[PDB]
Write a protein that binds this DNA or RNA. Structure first.
Ligand SMILES: [Mg+2]
Ligand SMILES: [Mg+2]
Ligand SMILES: [Mg+2]
Ligand SMILES: [Mg+2]
Ligand SMILES: [Mg+2]
Ligand SMILES: [Mg+2]
Ligand SMILES: [Mg+2]
Ligand SMILES: [Mg+2]
Ligand SMILES: [Mg+2]
Ligand SMILES: [Mg+2]
Ligand SMILES: [Mg+2]
Ligand SMILES: [Mg+2]
Ligand SMILES: [Mg+2]
Ligand SMILES: [Mg+2]
Ligand SMILES: [Mg+2]
Ligand SMILES: [Mg+2]
Ligand SMILES: [Mg+2]
Ligand SMILES: [Mg+2]
Ligand SMILES: [Mg+2]
Lengths: 63, 55, 143, 141, 63, 206, 145, 56, 70, 54
RNA sequence: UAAUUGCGAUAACGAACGAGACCUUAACCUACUAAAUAGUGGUGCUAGCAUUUGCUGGUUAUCCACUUCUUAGAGGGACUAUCGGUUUCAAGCCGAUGGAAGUUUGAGGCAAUAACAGGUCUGUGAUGCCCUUAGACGUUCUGGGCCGCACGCGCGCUACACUGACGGAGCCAGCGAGUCUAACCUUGGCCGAGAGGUCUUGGUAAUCUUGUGAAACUCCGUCGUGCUGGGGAUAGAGCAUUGUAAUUAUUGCUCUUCAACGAGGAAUUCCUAGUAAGCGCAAGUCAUCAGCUUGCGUUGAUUACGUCCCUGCCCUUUGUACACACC
């Protein structure tokens, strides 16, 4: 499996009608200089590290 | 005690309290001063009682 | 080096004192043993069925040594436990005032506790003698 | 009249008091060596101050501790505190300061609240429920 | 939410308005100042006022 | 280790390992490294302790929950399901019992297998109930590391609590077993199954 | 304790007092399947019969079992406290008995019929299939019969 | 005599209340406004705070 | 009341020839071999400790731990 | 009592075999709560009597 | 921001009620004043084990000293402090250091204007009117009933067990209360399996009950997954206590009888740290009766630290033929 390691850059806001979702931009430690904003589930802060199970796919506002 | 006279409404309870302060001071004195210290220094609000020797 | 009972582990000190009285036979065990229940708050009698009175006596003796004086009611409350009142909630219940009172008798006739002034029972000076003795014997099992 | 200090330590109701005189290294709790306390799963809890600072540092002092109130855990967190607060108070008046500062440093660096008494406390129950915040059950009809 | 009320900020304004030749950046001496210069009824209230005279003094030195 | 014996004697094996490596009950606290990139900074080991019982304030701030010893985090989650609310001294011993069992089979400090079991059952990505209107589909999301550790503890202990229920095996035996099978995912453990089936459902909504 | 190694002497289910008893369960508890003997009563009887509590019902040499019966159906002669027994201070002869397996079903009817036959309220209450001990009957007891 | 200190003060509080009630009913037409009791040796004193003591 | 509340000489020798290769052997471990119930399992743990075969590594009730001889 | 046990149509067995009347599982029946602000007296205090008193 | 709490914008400027302040309680004092009804060290007097000086107790006054612990008086302390992030560098807010304490410090008390045909004439010798008032709707006396049982609903209690029951053993709290013209809280000694009985005793209470030796909990065994030793409904027989009286069984003990219940459908409650939950205890009621309540301490988690999707309510905007105001 293509295990992808990306580090939280910024904490943007709470998505999801419930709110338990947070919008976060990450930078991969393997070949950085590209950033992609991902949706988290658990509580998150700056400089965390998300294990993105698929490299090239991102999302936005949730209902 | 519940504030309500009846039983209607959410069950609001209400605690009253009254504080009792008790002090005792031992003196070794003759017959005069004790009777002079007790006839005066009386106070409306302070219950003063003067017990006698150690038995 | 010197010793007391306070230097010995609380549990296995009694288990040695319990095994002592048995090994001695000077007991005065009432006789309603094996059928008494030691508290209303119990379901079944003690599972030792030959013993458990040496243990209670040894337990009683150690307790009275640790403090100034203890009473019959004081041991009823100490050894008491929680009684399941069937479908109703638990409550603390006192233990049998006859097992303990007859422990205070069978250990006083045996010379480990005397009927103290101020009420209660005091550890007999010969009891300290015997208690500190077998207590030191326990530290010879780990020597 | 020998060099001696006394300290304490309080966990949630229990107050363990400790007299620390100069001695030949004994540590007794209410009557009994520290090698017996027996909740016994927290035996190393009260051993901790003796090890944070080293098995020595006691060969010249005697400690004795009595604990009233509390509970079967409430007191164990008090005695470990009254022990360490005293060892660090004995160097306050009888040894030099820099050694005493080395003790607070080696204690607070690990510090399961060893010199510092925890402020937590049981919160009052308010009417309307069996607990502090817990409310009774309602049914709406 | 430690938003100071107006009675604090009203008193703090009125003190710096007329006691800058006092009232340094140290709350401690400012506290002691208030009990000599101002008539406050509460030790708690006075510490609230002095701590805020101390916030304003700090930033006046700075534009 | 230069022994010393004062009046009230401190035992040898007691004296020995204490002022030496400040290790666990009797297990080495060093050498334990989280076999994965992140969940470090969220798995505690170093700083070491003696038992997994601590009067710590891991609640009155958001992320300070992470600083609790991960072994102690394991215990906390053991003492629950109502009848075991509170009763930490109980689970504290169950952990000590458990670590020896983990130790017995297949060497490797059990405080390291616990790290292995945790990191192997935390879902990397998951799903959530996005409205979309009535017929709510599932949006794939990437669960943060803190939730990856928490859910790993809840999943493991739950898997052992329901398995150890109504059967001759004890809590520590099933707890160890679960941690043992979760060291490297054995596909025969409650936690691995639920972990993979959460990334399975998350994968089918991407 | 010890590792025992007995031969075919031990036997599974054995019958006494008109009921059946599992051989391979402890005898203090194996006796309780007899109606009229419980955990307390059993335990005191075996303590009296010089019987090893750590044994099962499957062991216990046939003399031990025959002794156990003789004590149960005569507790007052073998020094049992007469407040230990299910039926004392009888309502006809005054004597203290301990009714056993099939007899305990017999004495329930004899008592119940004595109350009915007398038309006492407690008996009338029994005849109506109601609760007798005085409990409320509004909210509890809905499935029973 | 021979009272507990707790029951004593509570019993003294009731005595003030009942004493006050009996005056608020009896001395209305005189501007009654309260009482105080001074417990001394040789005497037990009651002061009638009434705006018009000529009628009291 | 199902299989191995009792001693059964063939079961005794079964124990001796089978405790080897048990890296973990305890109350629950003895029951899982289609054999001794928990009561007589807690008796075997002291007899297999009378000499050799099992090494005590744990402490007490509700949790036993033994390991092969060394 | 002699007739109390004699009496048939008595005891659990008889009631247990009869249908449960539907009036058991009823509601509050509420009997006029949404008419609380409409005075049924039909009287209506007058403005002069109010100004005389207030 | 918890807040018409503030900043800022500003035809407004500056103010008051309500919020805040305040008050009570729980936290911090080796600083002040002290205490045989609170406790510590030392000394006598004193017992036990060791001896090489030691270790562990006894002794409401045999004396000396002290106030860390306890107690409550007067003070002190915090002001979200220091520093750094963030933001109109405004109010603020987040992080780190320090601190007894930094969630309005935690928990309460008090709480404006107004509304409701909310509840209470069954708390009142508070009261209008109406009824009744001697064969009484007055009042007292006897007995019964409010507990009555095909069923529907609500708060709970106890459980379905092996993080367990059971038996021994360890042994730790806090809020209270407790008897005068009286029988309240009760130690201790005996008798009793138990419940209890009997003889005495301290206490009008920091002095005596009481260290309330409470319960979970910790410890070593017995049991082995089997409705089993889990569970204790139901029921028979016996003995005690309260009370003038216990039958429809006030309560307590004993043996026996050993049901349903294998974690529970649709639904729905409560809750964010010493909190939840587990656990008992005191007080109220009380002659006897807690499965209730009000408080208390003991053991002590998981998960949020967010949002407006559900729901509930506030805010403007807007419409109105409503103003007895959508009843
Ligand atoms: Mg007990
Ligand atoms: Mg107890
Ligand atoms: Mg039976
Ligand atoms: Mg002081
Ligand atoms: Mg800090
Ligand atoms: Mg109405
Ligand atoms: Mg009224
Ligand atoms: Mg009547
Ligand atoms: Mg009623
Ligand atoms: Mg209610
Ligand atoms: Mg137990
Ligand atoms: Mg008798
Ligand atoms: Mg007297
Ligand atoms: Mg049972
Ligand atoms: Mg059964
Ligand atoms: Mg469930
Ligand atoms: Mg009561
Ligand atoms: Mg009630
Ligand atoms: Mg308009």
């Amino acid at each position: 499996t293509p295990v992808t390691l990306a580090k939280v850059i910024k904490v943007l806001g709470r998505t999801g009608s419930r709110g338990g979702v947070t919008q976060v931009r990450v930078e991969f430690l393997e070949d950085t200089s590209r950033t992609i904003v991902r949706n988290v589930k658990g509580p998150v802060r700056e400089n965390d590290i998300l294990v993105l199970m698929e490299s090239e796919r991102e999302a936005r506002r949730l209902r | 005690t519940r504030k309500t006279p009846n039983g209607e409404g959410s069950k609001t309870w209400e605690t009253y309290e009254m504080r009792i302060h008790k002090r005792y001071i031992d003196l070794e004195a003759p017959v005069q001063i004790v009777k002079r210290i007790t006839q005066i220094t009386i106070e409306p609000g302070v219950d003063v009682e003067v017990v006698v020797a150690s038995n | 080096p010197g010793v007391s009972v306070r230097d010995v582990a609380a549990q296995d000190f009694i288990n040695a004192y319990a095994s002592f009285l048995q090994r001695q036979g000077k007991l005065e065990v009432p006789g309603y043993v094996d059928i008494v229940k030691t508290s209303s708050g119990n379901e079944m009698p003690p599972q030792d069925a030959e013993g458990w009175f040496y243990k209670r006596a040894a337990s009683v003796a150690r307790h009275i040594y640790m403090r100034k004086q203890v009473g019959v009611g004081k041991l009823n409350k100490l050894y008491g436990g929680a009684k399941s009142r069937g479908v109703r909630p638990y409550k603390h219940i006192d233990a049998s005032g006859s097992i303990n009172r007859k422990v205070l008798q069978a250990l006083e006739k045996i010379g480990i506790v005397e009927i103290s002034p101020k009420g209660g029972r005091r550890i007999s000076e010969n009891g300290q003698r015997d208690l500190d003795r077998i207590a030191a014997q326990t530290l010879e099992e780990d020597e | 009249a020998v060099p001696s200090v006394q300290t304490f330590g309080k966990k949630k109701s229990a107050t363990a008091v400790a007299h620390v005189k100069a001695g030949k290294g004994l540590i007794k709790v209410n009557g009994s060596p520290i090698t017996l306390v027996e909740p016994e799963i927290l035996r190393f809890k009260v051993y901790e101050p003796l090890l944070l600072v080293g098995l020595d540092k006691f060969s010249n002092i005697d400690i004795r501790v009595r604990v009233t109130g509390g509970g079967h855990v409430s007191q164990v967190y008090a005695i470990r505190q009254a022990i360490a607060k005293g060892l660090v108070a004995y160097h306050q008046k009888y040894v030099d300061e820099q050694s005493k500062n080395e003790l607070k440093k080696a204690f607070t660096s690990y510090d399961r609240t060893l010199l510092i008494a925890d402020s937590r406390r049981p919160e009052p129950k308010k009417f309307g429920g069996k607990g502090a915040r817990s409310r009774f059950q309602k049914s709406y009809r | 939410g430690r938003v100071r009320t107006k009675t604090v900020k009203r008193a703090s304004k009125a003190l710096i308005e007329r006691y800058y030749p006092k009232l340094t950046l140290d709350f401690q001496t400012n506290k002691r100042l208030c009990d000599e210069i101002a008539t406050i009824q509460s030790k708690r209230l006075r510490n609230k006022i002095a701590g805020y005279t101390t916030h304003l003094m700090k930033r006046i030195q700075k534009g | 280790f230069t022994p010393v014996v004062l009046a009230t004697p401190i035992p040898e094996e007691v004296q020995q390992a204490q002022t030496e490596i400040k290790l666990f009950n009797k297990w080495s606290f060093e050498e334990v490294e989280v076999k994965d990139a992140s969940l470090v900074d969220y798995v505690q080991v170093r700083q070491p302790i003696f038992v997994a019982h601590t009067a710590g304030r891991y609640a009155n701030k958001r992320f300070r929950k992470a600083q609790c010893p991960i072994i102690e985090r394991l215990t906390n989650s053991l003492m629950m399901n109502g009848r075991n609310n509170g009763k930490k001294l109980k689970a504290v011993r169950i952990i000590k019992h458990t670590l020896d069992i983990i130790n017995v089979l297949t060497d490797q400090n059990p405080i390291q297998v616990v790290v292995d079991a945790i990191t192997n059952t935390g879902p990397r990505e998951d799903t959530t109930r996005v409205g979309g209107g009535g017929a709510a589909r599932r949006q794939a999301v990437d669960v943060s590391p803190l939730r990856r550790v928490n859910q790993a503890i809840a999943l493991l202990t739950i898997g052992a609590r329901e398995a150890a229920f109504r059967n001759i095996k004890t809590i520590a035996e099933t707890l160890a077993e679960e941690l043992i099978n979760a060291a490297k995912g054995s596909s025969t453990s409650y936690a691995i199954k639920k972990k993979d089936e959460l990334e399975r459902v998350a994968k089918s909504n991407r | 304790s010890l590792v025992v190694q007995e031969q075919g002497s031990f036997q599974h289910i054995l019958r006494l007092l008109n009921t059946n008893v599992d051989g391979n369960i402890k005898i203090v508890y194996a006796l309780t399947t007899i109606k009229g003997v419980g955990r307390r009563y059993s335990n005191l009887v075996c303590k009296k019969a010089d019987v090893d509590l750590h044994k099962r019902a499957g062991e216990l040499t046939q003399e031990e079992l025959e002794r156990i019966v003789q004590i149960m159906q005569n507790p007052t002669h073998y020094k049992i406290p007469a407040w230990f027994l299910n039926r004392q201070n009888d309502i006809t002869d005054g004597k203290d008995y301990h009714t056993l397996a099939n007899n305990v079903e017999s004495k329930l009817r004899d008592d119940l019929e004595r109350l009915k036959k007398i038309r006492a309220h407690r008996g009338i209450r029994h005849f109506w299939g109601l609760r007798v001990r005085g409990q409320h009957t509004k909210t509890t007891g809905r499935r029973r019969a | 005599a021979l009272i507990s200190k707790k029951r004593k003060l509570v019993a003294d509080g009731v005595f003030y209340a009942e004493l006050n009630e009996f005056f608020t009913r009896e001395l209305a037409e005189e501007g009654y406004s309260g009482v105080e009791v001074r417990v001394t040796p040789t005497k037990t004193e009651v002061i009638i705070r009434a705006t018009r003591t000529q009628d009291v | 009341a199902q299989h191995a509340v009792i001693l059964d000489q063939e079961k005794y020798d079964r124990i001796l020839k089978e405790v080897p290769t048990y890296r973990y052997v305890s109350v629950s471990v003895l029951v899982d071999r289609l054999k001794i119930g928990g009561s007589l399992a807690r008796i075997a743990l002291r007899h297999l400790e009378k000499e050799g075969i099992i090494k005590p590594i744990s402490k007490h009730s509700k949790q036993a731990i033994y390991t092969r001889a060394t | 009592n002699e007739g109390a046990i004699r009496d048939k149509t008595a005891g659990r067995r008889n009631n247990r075999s009869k249908d449960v009347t539907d009036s058991a599982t009823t509601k509050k029946s509420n009997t006029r709560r949404a008419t609380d602000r409409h005075s049924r007296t039909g009287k209506t205090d007058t403005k002069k009597k109010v100004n005389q008193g207030w």
